[PDB]
Structures are given as structure tokens and as C-alpha cells.
Amino acid sequence: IINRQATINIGTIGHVAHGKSTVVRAISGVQTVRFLERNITIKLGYANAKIYKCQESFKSDKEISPKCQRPGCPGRYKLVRHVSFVDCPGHDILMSTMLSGAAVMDAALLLIAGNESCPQPQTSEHLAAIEIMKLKHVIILQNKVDLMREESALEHQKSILKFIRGTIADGAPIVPISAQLKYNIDAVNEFIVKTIPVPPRDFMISPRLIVIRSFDVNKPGAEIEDLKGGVAGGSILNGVFKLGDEIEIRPGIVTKDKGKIQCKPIFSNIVSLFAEQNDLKFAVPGGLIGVGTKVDPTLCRADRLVGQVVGAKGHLPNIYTDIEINYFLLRRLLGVKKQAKVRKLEPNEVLMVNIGSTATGARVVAVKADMARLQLTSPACTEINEKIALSRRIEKHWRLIGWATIKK
């Protein structure tokens, strides 16, 4: 078996205590770490998957196990692609992590249960978000199908079909698969091979890195001096890294808390890399890699720096405080249990603007008809245009309004 790492990212969406983690487990082999010291930093889940060919009726394709025995052929599998999974929870309070996950993702999998409530706005909202964030590769999957009646499922499918056609996602495949009884995943695997292609990626463009998770390597058992460096789980979109480069977290931090601040952002060199199971040399983008840099084990532990941009020495981007946004509004609101109508923008009110992955608070000053000027409270960086989703407040918690683009 060759040690070729991740190439393309696939994600999973749903609801709490429904069936996403179970699905992930079914897909993979080794159990995940996520769900204070271990794993606890962000609500996002990271898991891997295998694409192995064995082609030497119509539906049979490949087996997840390293050695296939169930169909018949005892031959050795062809290496085509290795993939990394990002698990994102659809809880009503926390969605920043989900948003962050979306930015790195290039394939989306929808999972809704069968033996519960049918019309849910959250799923629709998720779909809308997917449509917005540069995606056409949408696969619909049904979770709990085994505890369902003979025609009810069919009816549900029909209803779904009726619902979904007038969207950005054109020819979306719909597959019903069980996660608790372990069946029918072959079809899914086949689909994964068929529908999803690989976009071009080269060494030319300057590196862009996003760190979601943070880890510390301190476990009880050994004596006093048995220490390892701080590991930062960072996923790459474009820009290849080799061992021997300086990694920096962009926004910066306060040095004394009186006294003026002028200290540059935190620089760190790579000590030990963690990919799939163990160590590797080259970092091919399109996967979440636990990069172990010279950042403190005391710093990376809790909710302090979740979802921030990472650059390299040599190339310099720009940091902004006043942001410029062009907005597009929707007809009626998404993600509300009954539906409510969208009001026009009002001056002097706290609203949350999500640019790419960051969750930041913004205040409205001057809006004519298309352009919007906003004031930031927590630091944020700007590169090109980014995938922007707006969130406004009416009652209790956050609600989506529409999509946005930066004009410069």
C-alpha cells in the first residue's frame, strides 16, 4: 500500500442524534476522536474514507475493507484516490464550524431520517448554503430506511423530487442506504467514482491555509520531561507545502494587559506532521492535516482561535477593519419553524457577517441600495472575494437572509 494522501474533500450534514457519526463509522474503520483536552476545540468532525477499485449486475463495485471477500474476487485493489471526511453538526446554536467546513468542502452529502418529521427548514437552509458556496456536486441520502413501510418511503422520495428541481443543483442522485445494519454502500461508492471530478491544482498560486482544530500532546503516565510540540489541525484549499517553511497565524494577539501594541503575528516552524495515521513529507492540498508547529501546548487548548487564516513567509496579504460588501436578498426567510418575510436593512443594529469561515460581529452605517459599509469588532483578513453568508437577528437566535460578494 502506497502512502499517497488526500485529494478531494467530502462533507456530511444533518441534525443532532439523527445519524451522521454512525454513517461516518460505517464508511471508515478506525474510530474518530471528536465527541476539554482531547478533540474539544470545534464542533466540526474529521474522518477518512477509501476509494479502491477492483474492476477486473451494474451495482457491484468495491468494498471498503482493505481486502475484499464478500463479492468473490481475491485480487489486490488499485489505488486511485484517498479522501478525507469533514463531519459538521446541524445544531441550532452553533453553525460557525459548519460554515468553516463548507468553505474547504468540494462535495456535499445530505442525510435526513425517514421515521420522523418530513418538512424541515434547516435542511432547506443547508441546501441553500451549499448552492451559494460554489457547488453543483450535491448527493441526497436517506438515513433510516429499514424501519419504514413499503410505499411510504417511495412517497417521501417523490415529494423530495417535487421539492428539488428549481435550484442550482441540477442532476442530483438520490440513494437510500442503511447505517445501522451495514448494507448498500457499494452504490454510494460507485456514485462517488462516477459523478465527482477533480479540479486543476498547481504550484503556481500563493498558499492559503485554514486551521479549524487545535490539539495538545500531554497525556498522564510518564515522568516530568516527556513533552511534544503543539499540533494545529489545518486544512488546505490551494498551495502545496514541503518541510522547511515558516507558518504564521495572521490576525495577531495582545502582548500586555496600558502599553501600546506593535508585536507582529505568531510565527512557527513545523516540527512533526500528522496525516491519515502517521508522518509524511509532502502536503498535497484538499485535506485536513494536523500540522505540529512550534505553537505552545498551553495556547492551543480551548476556544481562543477557531477558524482563522494561515499564511507563509515571502508573500504578504492584507488585514482590514472596515469591510465593503455587495448584498443580494431573498424573498422569504430560511431556517424558521411557519415562515416570515425579510425586512429592509436598518441603521444601528448588531448583525453577524460570516466571510469564508470567520464568525464576526458587524455594525451597519451607510447603505444606498447595493453597497454596504460595516464596522468590525474582532480582526479579519481579506484576499480575493470569499464565500460570504449573512446572518441577521429578529428573535432569540441567528437567521440567514442571503448571499454576498466583496467589490474591489
Binding site: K59, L161, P176, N184
Partner: peptide, 17 residues
């Protein structure tokens, strides 16, 4: 598009305890 699904459904129906 509504073609490769029915077969899968049939297969699912077939393979049960």
C-alpha cells in the same frame, strides 16, 4: 433524471432478515 434508483430499491427490498 430518474433512472438508476429503482433497481437499487429492489435490491434493498430483496436483501433483508
Amino acid at each position: 433524471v430518474g433512472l438508476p434508483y429503482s433497481e437499487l430499491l429492489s435490491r434493498f427490498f430483496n436483501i433483508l432478515r
